[PDB]
Amino acid sequence: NRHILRFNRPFLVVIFSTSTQSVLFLGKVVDPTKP
Amino acid sequence: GSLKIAPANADFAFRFYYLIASETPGKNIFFSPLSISAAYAMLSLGACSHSRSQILEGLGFNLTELSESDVHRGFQHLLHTLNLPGHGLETRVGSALFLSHNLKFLAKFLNDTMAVYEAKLFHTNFYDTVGTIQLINDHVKKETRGKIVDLVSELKKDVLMVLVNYIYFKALWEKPFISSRTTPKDFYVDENTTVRVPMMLQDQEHHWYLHDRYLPCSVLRMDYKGDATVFFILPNQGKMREIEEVLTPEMLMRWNNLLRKRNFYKKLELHLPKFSISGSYVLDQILPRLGFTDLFSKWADLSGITKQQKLEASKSFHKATLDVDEAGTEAAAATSFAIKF
Numbered sequence A: 001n002r003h004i005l006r007f008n009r010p011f012l013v014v015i016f017s018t019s020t021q022s023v024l025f026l027g028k029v030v031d032p033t034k035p
Numbered sequence B: 001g002s003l004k005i006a007p008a009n010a011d012f013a014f015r016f017y018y019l020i021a022s023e024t025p026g027k028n029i030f031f032s033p034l035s036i037s038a039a040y041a042m043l044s045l046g047a048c049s050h051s052r053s054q055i056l057e058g059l060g061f062n063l064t065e066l067s068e069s070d071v072h073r074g075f076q077h078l079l080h081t082l083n084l085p086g087h088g089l090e091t092r093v094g095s096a097l098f099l100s101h102n103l104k105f106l107a108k109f110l111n112d113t114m115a116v117y118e119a120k121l122f123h124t125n126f127y128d129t130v131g132t133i134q135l136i137n138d139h140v141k142k143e144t145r146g147k148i149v150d151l152v153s154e155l156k157k158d159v160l161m162v163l164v165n166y167i168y169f170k171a172l173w174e175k176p177f178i179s180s181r182t183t184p185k186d187f188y189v190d191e192n193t194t195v196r197v198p199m200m201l202q203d204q205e206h207h208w209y210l211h212d213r214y215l216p217c218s219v220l221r222m223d224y225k226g227d228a229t230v231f232f233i234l235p236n237q238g239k240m241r242e243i244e245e246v247l248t249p250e251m252l253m254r255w256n257n258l259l260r261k262r263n264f265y266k267k268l269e270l271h272l273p274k275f276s277i278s279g280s281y282v283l284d285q286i287l288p289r290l291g292f293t294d295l296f297s298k299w300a301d302l303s304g305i306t307k308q309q310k311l312e313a314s315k316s317f318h319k320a321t322l323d324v325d326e327a328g329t330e331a332a333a334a335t336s337f338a339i340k341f
Ligand SMILES: CO[C@H]1O[C@H](COS(=O)(=O)O)[C@@H](O[C@H]2O[C@@H](C(=O)O)[C@@H](O)[C@H](OC)[C@H]2OS(=O)(=O)O)[C@H](OS(=O)(=O)O)[C@@H]1OS(=O)(=O)O
Pocket: B210, B211, B212, B213, B214, B215, B258
C-alpha cells in the first residue's frame, strides 16, 4: 500500500514561505481533540 | 534579499521546537518561529553593547558573517515580502510598541522600529493595568482575526513598554478536499489511547510525498495557492522521538529537495484530519535555555530605549493557533515582550 497516507497518529507540521524561505509556523499534533 | 537571514531564522525555529518537544513530550506544540525572531530582533534595536549581540546570537545570527544592518534590513525585506498582495493567500505580519504616556523614549529607537519593522506606536497608562492589558490584547485579537486572545496574561505595574508582533496566515490548498467525504475516524494518540476526529479524504490527485528510506517516516508536502507550502511529517507509530532528534533545517532541505523530483509526484490516497491545535509559551521562562540568559538577567543593557530609567526585561508571551480544514489552513500567532524599571 505505497500510495496511501493516513494521518491517524501523531505528526509534525512545518508551514513554509517559499518566497522568503522562512518557517512561518512549526508544530506537532499529538491529540487533535485538544483545541 | 531576506535570504541572508534565512539560515539563522530556521536554526532558531528548530532549536525552539527541540527544546519544547524534549521538555514537554507527548503534548501538542504550535508556534511561529518567525514571530518570535522578528519580535526579538526588533527589541534588540533598543539593546546596547553585549546585550544587543547576545540577542542576535541567541536568534542564530553569526555576527562574523552578518552585520547588524544585514539582519535588520533582512527582516525589513522579509516582512515587506510577506505583507504583499496574494491571490489565494493572506499573510500579514505587523509590530507595535505600547509606550508609557510618561516616559521619554529615545527617538532613534522609535525611528528604527518604525523604519524596519513598521511598528505602530500606541501610548498607554501602565498604572491602569486592566485597561492596558485590554488595549494590547484587543489589538492583537483584531489583527489575528480573532484567533489570538489574551496574549498578555500578566502585566506588572512598573512596566513602561510592551513590544508586540503578530502574524496571520490564511491560505487555500492547491488540492483541496471535498467536505462531503469528511467523516469521523480513529486517531491513535499512543498504544493505549484512541480518539475520534473528522478525517478528510482525497484520492484523485497527485501529491508530492515520500517514504523516507533513511528514517522511520513519510513526508507529504502540500502546496497552498500563493507562495507557501506545508510539510506534514508522519513518523511510523512510536517513532516520533526519532524524527524529532533529526528535525533540523538541513533535514527540511533534504526532504524539500527530494520532493522537487517528479518521481515523488504520484497519485495518493490521503486521509488528513480536520482539526485545530494551539500553543502557549512563557518565553521569559524558556529563552534563557536558548541563549538569552543575558537578556533576562539583571545585567541586560536596554539603555537604547530610554536614558530616563534603568530598564529590565519583564514577561514575554507567545501564543499560536492552527486550523486545518478541507479548503485550506489558517494559522496565527503573536509575541509580546514587556520592559519594566
Ligand atoms: C537509505 O539509503 C538508501 O535509500 C536512498 C534513498 O533514500 S531516500 O533519500 O529516503 O529517497 C538511496 O539513494 C538514492 O538517493 C539519490 C539522491 O542522492 O538524491 C540518488 O543518489 C540515488 O541514486 C543514484 C538514490 O538511489 S535509489 O532511490 O535506490 O534509486 C540509497 O542508494 S545508494 O546507491 O546507497 O546511494 C540507499 O540505498 S541502499 O544502500 O539501502 O541499497
